mmCIF file of C-alpha atoms and ligand atoms in Angstrom:
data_model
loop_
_atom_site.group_PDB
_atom_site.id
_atom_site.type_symbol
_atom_site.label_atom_id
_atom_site.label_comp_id
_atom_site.label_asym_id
_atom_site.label_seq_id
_atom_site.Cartn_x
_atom_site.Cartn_y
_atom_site.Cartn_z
ATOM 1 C CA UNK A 1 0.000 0.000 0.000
ATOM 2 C CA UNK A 2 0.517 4.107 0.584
ATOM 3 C CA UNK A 3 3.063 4.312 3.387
ATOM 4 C CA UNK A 4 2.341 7.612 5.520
ATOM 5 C CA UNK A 5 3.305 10.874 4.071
ATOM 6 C CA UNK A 6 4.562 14.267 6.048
ATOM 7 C CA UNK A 7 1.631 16.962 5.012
ATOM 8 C CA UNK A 8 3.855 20.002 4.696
ATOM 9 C CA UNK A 9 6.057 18.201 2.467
ATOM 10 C CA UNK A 10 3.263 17.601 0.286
ATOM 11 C CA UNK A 11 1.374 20.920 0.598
ATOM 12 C CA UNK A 12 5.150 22.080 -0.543
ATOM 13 C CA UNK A 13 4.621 19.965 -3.629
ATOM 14 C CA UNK A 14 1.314 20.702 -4.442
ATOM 15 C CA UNK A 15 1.991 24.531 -4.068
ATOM 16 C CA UNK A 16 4.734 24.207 -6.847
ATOM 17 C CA UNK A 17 3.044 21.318 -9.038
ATOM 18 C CA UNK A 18 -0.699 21.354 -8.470
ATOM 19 C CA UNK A 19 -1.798 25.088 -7.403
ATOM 20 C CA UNK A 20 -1.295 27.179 -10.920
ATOM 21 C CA UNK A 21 -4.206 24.273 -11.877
ATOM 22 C CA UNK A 22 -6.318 22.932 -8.768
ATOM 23 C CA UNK A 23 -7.862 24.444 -5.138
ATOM 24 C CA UNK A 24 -8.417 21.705 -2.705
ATOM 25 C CA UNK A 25 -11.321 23.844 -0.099
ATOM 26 C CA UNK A 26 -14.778 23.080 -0.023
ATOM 27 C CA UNK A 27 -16.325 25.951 -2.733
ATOM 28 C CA UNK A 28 -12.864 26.505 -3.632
ATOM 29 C CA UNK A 29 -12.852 27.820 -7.544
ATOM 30 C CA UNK A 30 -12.495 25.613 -10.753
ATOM 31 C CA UNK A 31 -9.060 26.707 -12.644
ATOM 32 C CA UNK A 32 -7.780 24.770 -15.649
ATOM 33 C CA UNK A 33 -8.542 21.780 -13.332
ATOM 34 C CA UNK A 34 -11.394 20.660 -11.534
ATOM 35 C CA UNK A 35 -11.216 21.701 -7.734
ATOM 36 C CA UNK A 36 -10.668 18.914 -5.535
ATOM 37 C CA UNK A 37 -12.765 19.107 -2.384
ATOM 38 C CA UNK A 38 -14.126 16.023 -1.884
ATOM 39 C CA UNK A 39 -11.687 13.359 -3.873
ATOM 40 C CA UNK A 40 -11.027 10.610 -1.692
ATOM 41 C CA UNK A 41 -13.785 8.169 -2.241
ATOM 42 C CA UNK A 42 -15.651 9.964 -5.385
ATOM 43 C CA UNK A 43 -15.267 8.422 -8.545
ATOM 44 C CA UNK A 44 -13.522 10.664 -11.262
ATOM 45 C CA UNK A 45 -14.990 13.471 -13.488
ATOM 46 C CA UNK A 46 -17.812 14.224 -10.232
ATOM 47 C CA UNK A 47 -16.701 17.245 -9.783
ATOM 48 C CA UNK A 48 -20.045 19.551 -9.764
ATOM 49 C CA UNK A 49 -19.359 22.345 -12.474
ATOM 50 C CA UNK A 50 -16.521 21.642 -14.471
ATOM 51 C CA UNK A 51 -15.831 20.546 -17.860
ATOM 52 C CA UNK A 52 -14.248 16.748 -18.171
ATOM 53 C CA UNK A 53 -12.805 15.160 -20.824
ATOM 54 C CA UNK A 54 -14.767 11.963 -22.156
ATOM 55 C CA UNK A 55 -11.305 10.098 -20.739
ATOM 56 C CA UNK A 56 -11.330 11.211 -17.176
ATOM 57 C CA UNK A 57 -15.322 10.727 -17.093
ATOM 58 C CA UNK A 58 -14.779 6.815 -18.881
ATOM 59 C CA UNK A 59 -11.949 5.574 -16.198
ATOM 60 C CA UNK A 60 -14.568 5.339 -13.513
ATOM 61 C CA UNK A 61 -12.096 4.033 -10.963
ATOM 62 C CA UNK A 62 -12.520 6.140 -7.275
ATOM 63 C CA UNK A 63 -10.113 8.011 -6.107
ATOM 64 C CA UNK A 64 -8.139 7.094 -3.225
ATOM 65 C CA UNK A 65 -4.495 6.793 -1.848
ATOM 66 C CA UNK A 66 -3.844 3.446 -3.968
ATOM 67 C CA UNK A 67 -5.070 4.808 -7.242
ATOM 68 C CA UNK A 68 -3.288 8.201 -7.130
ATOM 69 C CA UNK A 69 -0.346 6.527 -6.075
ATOM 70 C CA UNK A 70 -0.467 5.067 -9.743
ATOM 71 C CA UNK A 71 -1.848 8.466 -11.475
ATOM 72 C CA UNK A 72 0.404 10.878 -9.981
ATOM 73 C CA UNK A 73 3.314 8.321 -11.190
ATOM 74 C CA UNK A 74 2.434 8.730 -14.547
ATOM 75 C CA UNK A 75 -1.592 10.384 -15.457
ATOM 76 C CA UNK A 76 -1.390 9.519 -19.101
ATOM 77 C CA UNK A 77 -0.365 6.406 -18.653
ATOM 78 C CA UNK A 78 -3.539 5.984 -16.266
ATOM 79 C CA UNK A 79 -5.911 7.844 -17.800
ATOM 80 C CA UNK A 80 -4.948 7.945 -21.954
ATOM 81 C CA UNK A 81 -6.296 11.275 -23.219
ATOM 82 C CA UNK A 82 -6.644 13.205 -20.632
ATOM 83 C CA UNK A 83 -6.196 17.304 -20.760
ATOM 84 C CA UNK A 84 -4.455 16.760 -17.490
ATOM 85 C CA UNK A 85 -0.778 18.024 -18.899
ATOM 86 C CA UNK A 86 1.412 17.085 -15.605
ATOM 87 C CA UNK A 87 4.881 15.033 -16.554
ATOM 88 C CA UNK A 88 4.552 13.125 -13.120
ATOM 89 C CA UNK A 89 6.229 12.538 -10.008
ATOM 90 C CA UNK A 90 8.623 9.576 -10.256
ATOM 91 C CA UNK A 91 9.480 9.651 -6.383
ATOM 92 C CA UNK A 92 7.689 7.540 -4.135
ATOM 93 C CA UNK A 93 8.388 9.394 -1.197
ATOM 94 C CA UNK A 94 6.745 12.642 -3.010
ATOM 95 C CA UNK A 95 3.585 11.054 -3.947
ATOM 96 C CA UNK A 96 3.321 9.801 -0.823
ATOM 97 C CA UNK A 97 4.020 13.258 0.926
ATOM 98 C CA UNK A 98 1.483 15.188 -1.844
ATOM 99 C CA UNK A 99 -1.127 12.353 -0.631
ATOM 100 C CA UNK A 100 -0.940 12.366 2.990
ATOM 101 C CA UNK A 101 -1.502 16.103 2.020
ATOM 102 C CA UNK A 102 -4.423 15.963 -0.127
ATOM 103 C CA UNK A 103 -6.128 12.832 2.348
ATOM 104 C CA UNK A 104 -5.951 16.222 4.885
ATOM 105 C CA UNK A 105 -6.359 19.253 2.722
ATOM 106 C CA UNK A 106 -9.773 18.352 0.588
ATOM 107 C CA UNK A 107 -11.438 16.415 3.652
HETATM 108 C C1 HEC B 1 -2.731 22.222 -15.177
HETATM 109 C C2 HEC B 1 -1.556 22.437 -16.149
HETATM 110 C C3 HEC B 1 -2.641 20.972 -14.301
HETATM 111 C C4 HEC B 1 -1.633 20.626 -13.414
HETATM 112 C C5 HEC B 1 -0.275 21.268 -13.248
HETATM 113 C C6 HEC B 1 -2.168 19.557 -12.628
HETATM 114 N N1 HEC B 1 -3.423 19.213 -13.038
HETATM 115 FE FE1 HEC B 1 -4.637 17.828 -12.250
HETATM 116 N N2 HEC B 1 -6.002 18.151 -13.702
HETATM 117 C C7 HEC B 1 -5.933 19.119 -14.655
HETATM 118 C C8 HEC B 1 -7.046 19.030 -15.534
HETATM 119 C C9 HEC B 1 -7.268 19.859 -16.766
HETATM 120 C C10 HEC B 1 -7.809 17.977 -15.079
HETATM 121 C C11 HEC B 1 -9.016 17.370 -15.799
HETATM 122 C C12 HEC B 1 -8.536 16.309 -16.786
HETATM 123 C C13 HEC B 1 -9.564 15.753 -17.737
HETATM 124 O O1 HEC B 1 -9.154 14.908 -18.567
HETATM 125 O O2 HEC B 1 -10.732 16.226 -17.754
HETATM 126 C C14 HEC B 1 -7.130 17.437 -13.952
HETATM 127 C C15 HEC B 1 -7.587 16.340 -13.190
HETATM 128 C C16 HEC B 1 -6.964 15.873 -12.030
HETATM 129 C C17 HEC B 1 -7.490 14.836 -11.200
HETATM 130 C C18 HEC B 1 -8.790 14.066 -11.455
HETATM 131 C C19 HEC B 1 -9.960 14.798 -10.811
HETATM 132 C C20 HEC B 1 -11.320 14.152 -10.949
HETATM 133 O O3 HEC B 1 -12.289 14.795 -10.460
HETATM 134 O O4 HEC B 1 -11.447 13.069 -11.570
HETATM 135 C C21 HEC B 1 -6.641 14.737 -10.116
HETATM 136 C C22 HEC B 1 -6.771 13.788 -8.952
HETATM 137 C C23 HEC B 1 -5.641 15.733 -10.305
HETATM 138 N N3 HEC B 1 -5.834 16.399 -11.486
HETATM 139 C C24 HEC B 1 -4.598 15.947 -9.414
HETATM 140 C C25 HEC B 1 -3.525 16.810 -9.633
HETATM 141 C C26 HEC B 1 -2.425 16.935 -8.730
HETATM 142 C C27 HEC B 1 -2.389 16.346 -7.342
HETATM 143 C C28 HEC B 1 -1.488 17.720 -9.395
HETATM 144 C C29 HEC B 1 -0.093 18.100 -8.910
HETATM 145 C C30 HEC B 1 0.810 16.873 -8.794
HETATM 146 C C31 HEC B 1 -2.080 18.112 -10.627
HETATM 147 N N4 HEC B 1 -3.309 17.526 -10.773
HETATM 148 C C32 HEC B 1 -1.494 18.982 -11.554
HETATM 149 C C33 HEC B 1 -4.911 20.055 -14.791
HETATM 150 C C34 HEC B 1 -3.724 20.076 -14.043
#
C-alpha cells in the first residue's frame, strides 16, 4: 500500500506542481482543473461544475491513496487522453508526501 506521508512536504509539492491548476477547499474555484474538495472516495470526473474530458469521465475508478499513487506516477499512462498536462512525479516518497496532504487538505 501508501506508506504515511509528512503533510507540509506535500502541501510544498502541491503549491509548486498542483496550485497554478487545482484548489483543494470546499467551494474553492475551478481553474484549468477541476477543484478537488471532496476526492477521496468519489469516482472521477464528479466534480459539480466543471468541464471533463470523455477520458477522465470513462476511467470510472474512485479516487483514493492506492489509485493516485499510480496516477500521480504517470496520469497519461492511467488515464490515456486526458487534458491533465502534468509530466509526473517519479518519487515515491513525493507522492506519498502530496497524498498524505491531499487525504488532509480536501477532507
Ligand atoms: C494544469 C496544467 C494541471 C496541473 C499542473 C495539474 N493538473 Fe490535475 N487536472 C488538470 C485538468 C485539466 C484535469 C481534468 C482532466 C480531464 O481529462 O478532464 C485534472 C484532473 C486531475 C485529477 C482528477 C480529478 C477528478 O475529479 O477526476 C486529479 C486527482 C488531479 N488532477 C490531481 C492533480 C495533482 C495532485 C497535481 C499536482 C501533482 C495536478 N493535478 C497537476 C490540470 C492540471
Amino acid at each position: 500500500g501508501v506508506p504515511a506521508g509528512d503533510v507540509e512536504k506535500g502541501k510544498k509539492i502541491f503549491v509548486q506542481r498542483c496550485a497554478q491548476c487545482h484548489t483543494v477547499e470546499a467551494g474553492g474555484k475551478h481553474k484549468v482543473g477541476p477543484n478537488l474538495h471532496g476526492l477521496f472516495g468519489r469516482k472521477t470526473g464528479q466534480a459539480a461544475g466543471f468541464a471533463y474530458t470523455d477520458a477522465n469521465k470513462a476511467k470510472g475508478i474512485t479516487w483514493n491513496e492506492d489509485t493516485l499513487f499510480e496516477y500521480l506516477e504517470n496520469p497519461k499512462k492511467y488515464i490515456p487522453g486526458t487534458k491533465m498536462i502534468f509530466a509526473g512525479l517519479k518519487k515515491p516518497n513525493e507522492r506519498g508526501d502530496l497524498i498524505a496532504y491531499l487525504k488532509s487538505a480536501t477532507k
